[PDB]
Design a protein around this ligand. Structure first.
Ligand code: BCL
Ligand code: BCL
Ligand code: BCL
Ligand code: BCL
Ligand code: BCL
Ligand code: BCL
Ligand code: CLA
Ligand code: CLA
Ligand code: IKV
Ligand code: IKV
Ligand code: SF4
Ligand code: CA
Ligand code: CA
Lengths: 667, 654
């Protein structure tokens, strides 16, 4: 039975094979299918966007009660208020009129989404036939909306990616102009060019439509020759776009933090502090053990509050819970974690293409300064050498400051908070970047600098060591593959050497700076691991450094304070248990025990065969499966990263509890 | 033949003889006496000359109820009766310094085979000796034990002699006559003589007839040392179990329960604080503001023993210590034992051993059936009890339209077992099944070490042998083969053991185990005490344990430093336990070249360092040590933060 048993392990091996999570890969799809897939998802995205609109209705058009508050719509409510579809009004009439508008935009997105899905099926199946005029169209050569195509594109379509830039830019100016008309005609916002009103978003919707159209014609006549090697392969271009989109998303996250709490954005974001929100899963009106409410009601029982019915979600004061910043932290963090994730994948899917060329030898044939200036091994170890040195001199300079501040605050080794770095704060030149600048701001800048250079090491290694490294050229070895776990025990072992594993060590290392953001935007103290504890000098910070605000907690005391509100909620606490349960299970597949599970699975499948035969008359052969290391490090990073930030949501959605009253010394 | 020149294998049984072992054991009991004499000096509350004594330390708290029981230490609140106590502790500390110095001298010469005494000018023989002159001649027919089996009788005799000596010491020096009633310390002298009679009689029966059981254990030092460690660990677990039931018996109240009534000043505890502008002068405080104003500046503040619950904190620190070790020694006994089963399978003495402790598991057929029963029972129990805890958590959080009425509040230990618990409740039914599941879980890693040290039913299928005990894996072949050696199976017993090693910490700190969430301000978390008529209010639930217990940890500037250090140590184990060993080897190469390049350009002289990286087997070693040490550096904080269970339950909030 050895052979049959081996045909199975062979059915689950570390060698190249087809996997369910690689079927929509760029390699097996032509350029007509990428366009078709993007269209079908935007149709689904419109269907999704139309559900975030129906959910926002508080009172239905017929006047009856609607939906309870939910986080999906909350992150978009300040935008629909800004555009006039949604309105913050106590009057039930405004609440009933508003609901009709959201329902109308939801049905509209249902119609347009259905068109994009239809226009995404025919493109995918190359069945792009006009149902009215029997004649079909050509992807390579088409008129592009008839007469409009002839005047601007000389009646021709782009045959190469570098050419598609001009037409794509022209298509963008038709959206910039298209939105500038929707705002003017449907939403009633005329283009007044003053940057304190929503009317400025129509004026710049036309300025941008002019810049892009002019820029889209210059690239039609003069397509850029930069990164020509990308025009040859889809994944090469798709990865540079993803490395670019991630920095774009991080930028969007950073401006939505500065802007959403500007005075001009007060009518939409700060305005929320004066609203009562019934969030789902929040503590409801409790009832007694012997509580039976019959037709007569309130008989032979008792209930909590008595100002609301049994099992009804209780109100929540926006000012107390800090709703404004909670929403501002949920949007800013979303576009930052995603931005970081996009950058990591751009480098991964990019080095995934650098491996394909090194194997085929096209690497030495590239002429772009974007690859040529990076094929020298001496130059690589210099770039990586400086990145590692900078990462070290900055992770040790800022960690020792945080540790020293912690030691001074806890009076360890007879040291008072006076000897700590309370005098160190950002220089005067940078003081404009921060409100009430302090050591909490000097540390955060250096932590992000150290947290970027740390995860950059794993990225420079994907870019430079996809096929070979100075060590494996020394050890005479080839990295044939992007997802190979290790070469075995040899040379003290060589686990985690592929670029997919280096991607994992960028996501795992990126959890620190991805947490220095969560902690810093929630008004937490980052200069000390212990701030505000009932101990020696933790509460002396607000007056030793003269801070205008009072931070919620320090790195360690953050978990205790922020979770007082999590434990009070029956749903925020379910996330705390699920999120922790998912995270530890990563250790089972990330620890070097893949072999043990396999011999264990053998005993599992042997015992089941034994029990089934001794009890029943049938033969139970299930051949218990076990994941491979590369398949383990995959699921391991998804359980680790995916459970780590299932709970970061709880820190941001539990409320914003930074104040404006610095504490006096606990003298 | 895998290398064994590592620094942590220097004192291996292979590198030592029977004479050296005796020397090694003696060279430590002398050190242990030196240690025991420091736990005595530190416990001086007031010096003999009248100068103030030493602030409370945890090393002396776990022995103070014993020295009080023996009369060396007193609980008296008066300095006059507390000034004598100090003199006594000095007497026994100096005494243990003298006896320790003798045992080290009698260990240094034993270790160097130099058994010569200057006064008698004659060198003794290890192979044969009279044993304390005529006494041994009458009992051992003028001869000494020639083997481990023949050493049982003489070794048992020595135990009887030691017991008799302790009894004489209690009667003559400590003044406790042997009265045979089991509510007084005087019964520890009566049974010190009954045991000295049982052992002496038992030590003669084993000298005349040496035991033939486990005959192969005589042949190898590690084979016998491992069976002793599998036995000593179980003994230590039993001592921890017994000390929990006994230390809070009515007869032990004068020593353990009495701690509550005292005021303790532990080092590193909250002290009288001062203002930033504080300028203390000899005579008085000037232009300064100091908190409390009842003690001097920077003076440790008092702590009410009753609020702290020191009688149960000290009981836990001792009970858990002899259990954290008892299970570590059971794991090491199987490890060092399977470490010997690898050698007899490599040099092939296994098929010829007639011992039923090796012959019983000879055939692979039975091995799969034995491991298939440990594995099936662990599944049917770790699931039956986890689904109860999860269901109880769901019912009280009112998730999926359920209430605390639908929970497992009506499930509790059967009437036959109710005597085992002061207050029976689902918290007790779950704990018994969690320990049962937590033992069968880590037993799987132990049955593996015993049966699959060299070859498994899978490796025999894959045509492979496990040549070593500390081989990380066989490469990425067959999808991967990592963590297959018995040293790695030892790690997966220590790592898996952390759950039952935590179900004890939680359950002895008076926490709830029948629900992840107990006592939180949610729908039915606070409705437990009345739905099940609990006579006690458990401190918190499995998850809410971390929030409540840590309110006292954050208030202490030293208990919080442990929290930080303990967490820092633990996550670093991820660096050496993740499959990133190949990545570390490359990275270091860049660091060596980078440092060489920086030194080259920066200084005319070129200096290189060749940065080193640990091996996987050397990684999984430092990994388990960082994971285990980190995980129980902080379990200490749960036990030493106070015992906060109360005997008053909470009514439903409604
Ligand atoms: C998560 C960390 C990495 C990541 C790691 C990986 C890994 C690991 C793999 C891919 C693979 C793929 N990646 Mg990638 N990838 C990320 C971000 C992206 C993004 C993006 C949203 O910006 C896109 C469009 C892509 C695009 C793609 C395709 C080229 C390819 C096959 C997809 C597939 O079949 O999925 C599965 C199809 C489904 C319908 C399942 C649901 C997928 C949803 C739609 C998300 C798509 C992106 C996601 C990471 C795909 C892989 C999921 C696996 C569980 C890892 N990646 C980030 C940066 N990517 C595979 C490949 O061939 O690489 C050369 C591969 O092995
Ligand atoms: C920690 C988990 C395991 C454990 C795992 C290991 C591992 C792993 C190794 C040993 C090894 C040894 N073990 Mg063991 N061992 C444990 C418990 C014990 C106990 C006990 C206190 O009951 C004893 C007496 C021993 C005895 C010994 C020796 C036979 C041998 C060499 C010791 C040495 O040089 O240490 C180092 C000497 C020092 C002076 C350092 C300080 C050591 C102190 C005194 C504690 C001794 C026990 C400790 C586990 C030794 C190893 C420390 C390493 C860092 C792992 N083990 C528990 C059960 N043991 C080695 C061997 O050859 O095994 C075949 C080996 O590779
Ligand atoms: C800002 C928008 C993002 C991005 C967001 C996404 C997301 C998110 C997904 C895709 C999906 C896909 N994208 Mg896209 N897409 C981007 C730019 C590109 C570029 C490029 C050369 O610039 C290319 C070739 C592709 C190609 C593709 C395919 C891998 C896939 C369509 C297959 C499918 O729908 O099933 N994208 C940029 C970087 N695209 C989908 C998919 O199936 O991924 C596996 C998908 O879910
Ligand atoms: C949102 C709409 C989606 C889309 C969804 C559809 C739909 C819907 C249909 C097609 C179909 C067609 N698609 Mg398409 N497709 C898109 C993008 C493109 C692009 C491109 C790279 O810009 C090209 C060259 C094509 C090519 C083609 C035509 C050759 C084909 C013609 C039959 C027909 O009814 O034609 C009329 C169209 C033409 C003769 C081509 C010239 C006009 C433009 C290019 C048509 C697409 C819509 C236009 C861009 C929308 C407005 C954009 C404004 C900026 C707001 N599509 C746009 C972005 N595609 C047909 C099909 O599959 O039938 C089964 C079809 O009915
Ligand atoms: C409670 C008594 C414990 C035990 C507790 C310890 C501890 C604890 C240590 C040793 C130490 C040692 N023990 Mg012992 N020892 C036990 C029984 C034995 C048996 C046996 C056949 O039963 C043997 C051969 C040994 C042998 C040894 C050596 C491995 C070692 C001497 C090194 C040294 O002193 O310097 N022990 C039992 C199981 N022994 C010491 C050592 O160096 O271990 C590495 C040490 O620290
Ligand atoms: C607590 C003391 C320690 C110890 C510490 C010492 C010391 C101290 C000395 C020796 C030395 C000797 N050890 Mg030794 N050794 C121990 C255990 C043993 C055992 C054993 C397996 O029981 C044996 C056979 C030996 C063998 C020997 C003698 C042959 C040798 C003789 C020179 C001398 O001065 O002798 C007098 C002793 C004898 C002639 C042997 C017969 C008497 C017993 C066995 C001696 C040991 C002390 C005795 C057991 C203590 C009281 C036990 C009560 C229960 C309290 N030791 C005991 C348990 N060993 C000597 C040495 O190394 O000199 C450089 C020495 O001075
Ligand atoms: C909750 C976590 C968890 C669970 C259920 C298991 C379970 C198991 N492990 Mg693993 N393991 C874990 C964590 C866990 N481990 C971690 C963190 C590590 C790293 C140290 C390891 C390392 C590891 C090794 C090295 C090996 C295993 C092996 C095994 C199996 C042998 C025990 C057995 O037969 O029955 C035990 C009893 C049960 C499984 C009863 C079921 C318990 C519950 C009901 C399971 C369902 C709950 C689950 C979490 C649901 C997920 C919900 C989702 C939202 C996440 C068993 C399937 C061995 C094996 O044979 O591999 C196949 C083996 O060699 N364990
Ligand atoms: C605090 C934890 C910590 C620290 C300091 C490091 C540091 C390092 N890692 Mg590691 N790593 C960690 C956790 C950590 N890692 C974890 C949890 C994992 C698992 C995901 C990994 C996985 C891992 C891989 C896979 C790789 C490394 C690599 C590296 C090195 C490359 C970065 C560099 O050159 O300078 C970074 C900057 C510094 C080191 C500055 C120093 C920072 C402080 C001051 C260090 C001293 C504090 C320390 C905790 C003191 C201990 C006190 C004691 C009580 C515990 C670097 C030495 C790479 C390498 O080259 O290996 C050699 C590599 O391939 N990391
Ligand atoms: C994967 C690894 C990386 C993870 C991803 C990191 C990307 C995020 C990128 C950092 C940006 C964070 C984003 C949120 C924006 C935000 O916060 O902006 C406002 C402002 C403070 O606002 C107020 O915040 C309150 C909260 O407590 C205060 O109380 C108050 O006093 C203060 O005024 O913050 C800064 O000025 C930003 C500091 C960081 C400074 C950046 C320095 C980096 C620049 C140099 C080079 C770095 C890159 C090196 C190469 C890799
Ligand atoms: C590591 C790998 C595996 C883990 C196992 C190793 C550790 C085991 C170390 C024993 C741990 C015990 C700790 C100290 C003993 C102690 O507690 O004894 C008293 C008593 C309750 O006392 C009071 O405790 C209060 C605290 O809340 C309560 O409120 C109150 O109501 C109650 O009366 O406990 C029992 O009766 C013990 C329960 C467990 C029952 C044992 C069942 C196991 C027996 C069957 C087979 C198991 C083995 C299977 C084979 C491997
Ligand atoms: S345990 Fe995994 S990562 Fe480590 S050497 Fe073996 S196969 Fe490679
Ligand atoms: Ca918060
Ligand atoms: Ca406690």
């Amino acid at each position: 039975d050895a052979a049959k048993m081996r045909r199975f392990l062979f059915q689950r091996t570390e060698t190249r094979s087809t996997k369910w999570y690689q079927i929509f890969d760029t390699e097996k799809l032509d350029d007509e299918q990428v366009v078709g897939g993007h269209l079908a998802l935007l149709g689904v995205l419109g269907f999704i966007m139309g559900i975030y609109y129906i959910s926002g209705i508080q009172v239905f058009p017929w006047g009856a009660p609607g939906f309870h508050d939910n986080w999906f719509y909350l992150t978009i409510k300040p935008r629909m208020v800004s555009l006039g579809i949604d309105t913050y009004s106590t009057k039930t009439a405004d609440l009933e009129a508003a609901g009709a508008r959201l329902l109308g935009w939801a049905a509209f997105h249902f119609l347009v989404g259905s068109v994009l899905i239809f226009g995404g099926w025919r493109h995918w199946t190359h069945n792009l036939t006009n149902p009215f005029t029997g004649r079909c169209g050509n992807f390579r050569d088409f008129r592009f909306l008839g007469k409009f195509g002839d005047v601007v594109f000389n009646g021709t379509s782009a045959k190469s990616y570098k050419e598609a830039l001009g037409p794509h830019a022209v298509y963008m100016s038709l959206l910039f102009l298209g939105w500038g008309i929707v705002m003017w005609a449907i939403l009633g916002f005329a283009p007044i060019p003053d940057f304190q009103t929503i009317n400025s978003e129509t004026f710049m919707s036309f300025v941008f439509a002019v810049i892009f159209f002019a820029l889209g014609i210059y690239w039609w006549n003069n397509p850029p020759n930069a990164a020509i090697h990308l025009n040859d392969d889809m994944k090469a271009a798709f990865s540079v776009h993803l490395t670019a989109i991630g920095y774009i998303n991080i930028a969007l996250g950073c401006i939505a933090f500065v802007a959403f709490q500007q005075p001009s954005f007060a009518p939409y974001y700060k305005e929320l502090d004066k609203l009562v929100f019934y969030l789902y899963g929040e503590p409801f009106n409790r009832v007694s053990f012997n509580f039976v409410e019959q037709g007569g009601k309130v008989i032979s029982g008792a209930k909590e509050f008595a100002d609301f019915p049994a099992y009804a979600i209780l109100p929540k004061s926006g000012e107390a819970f800090g709703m404004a910043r909670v929403v501002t932290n949920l949007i800013v963090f979303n576009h930052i974690i995603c931005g970081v994730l996009y950058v990591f994948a751009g480098v991964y899917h990019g080095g995934q293409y650098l491996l394909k060329i090194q194997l085929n030898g096209m690497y030495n044939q590239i002429k772009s300064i974007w690859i040529t200036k990076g094929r020298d091994q001496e130059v690589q170890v210099k770039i990586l050498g400086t990145v590692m040195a900078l990462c070290f001199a900055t992770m040790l300079s800022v960690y020792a400051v945080i540790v020293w501040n912690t030691i001074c605050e806890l009076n360890i080794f007879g040291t008072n908070i006076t000897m700590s770095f309370y005098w160190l704060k950002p220089l005067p030149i940078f003081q404009w970047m921060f409100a009430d600048p302090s050591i909490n701001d000097w540390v955060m800048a250096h932590v992000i600098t150290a947290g970027s250079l740390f995860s950059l090491i794993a990225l420079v290694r994907i870019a430079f060591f996809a096929h070979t490294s100075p060590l494996w050229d020394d050890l005479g070895l080839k990295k044939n593959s992007y997802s190979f776990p290790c070469l075995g025990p040899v040379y003290g072992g060589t686990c985690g050497v592929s670029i997919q594993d280096q991607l994992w060590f960028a996501m795992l290392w990126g959890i620190k700076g991805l947490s220095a953001v969560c902690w810093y935007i929630d008004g937490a103290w980052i200069a000390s691991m212990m701030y505000g504890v009932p101990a020696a000098d933790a509460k002396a910070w607000d007056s030793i450094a003269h801070l205008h605000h009072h931070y919620t907690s320090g790195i360690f005391y953050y978990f205790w304070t922020e979770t007082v509100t999590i434990f009070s909620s029956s749903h925020l606490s379910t996330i705390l248990m699920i999120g922790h349960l998912v995270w530890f299970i990563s250790f089972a597949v990330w620890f070097e025990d893949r072999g043990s599970r396999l011999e264990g699975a053998d005993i599992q499948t042997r015992t089941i065969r034994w029990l089934g035969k001794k009890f029943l008359n049938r033969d139970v052969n299930f051949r218990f499966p076990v994941l491979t290391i590369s398949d383990s490090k995959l699921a391991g990073t998804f359980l680790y990263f995916g459970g780590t930030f299932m709970l970061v949501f709880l820190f941001l959605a539990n409320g914003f509890y930074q104040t404006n009253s610095p504490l006096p010394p606990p003298v």
